Amino acid sequence: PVARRKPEQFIQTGISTIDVMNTLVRGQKLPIFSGSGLPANEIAAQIARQATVRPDLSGEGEKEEPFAVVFAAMGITQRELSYFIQEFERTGALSRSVLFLNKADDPTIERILTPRMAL
């Protein structure tokens, strides 16, 4: 806890009502409290293929950072797994990401170990 600084820049995520009214800074961990039948996986795919840093909006540092989406889906319906394979490989925004996926029928201890792997 001495070896970290505070988060001070921002990120755009494509979503307007995230970019303007409750900003995602780089270091923040903000959860999306979905409902039950609401689209949460669609907003997952949208933030996954639309997030981009804006160093041009800063005082023009380097683009030496690339961006990387580590996407870890645990306990999914497998219909949604087809949704994630096509909605990642569709636009060619799979090339800056890594998908740790597991279905619902896969055993429970992989649904334990998955966010350890991704983080």
Added chain:
Amino acid sequence: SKLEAILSQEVEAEIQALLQEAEAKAEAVKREAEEKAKALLQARERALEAQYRAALRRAESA
């Protein structure tokens, strides 16, 4: 006769100047129609430019 021609040419000049300003009103209508036309065509130019520019971006990354 004489007074017919005098007063009728007066009404002619008055309503001819006013109806040519109404032709200028119609010409401002055509002017703004050309404005909306060029805004239509140029926004569609920008739209097709940006869409197929991003399509080249996506085909490049794929």
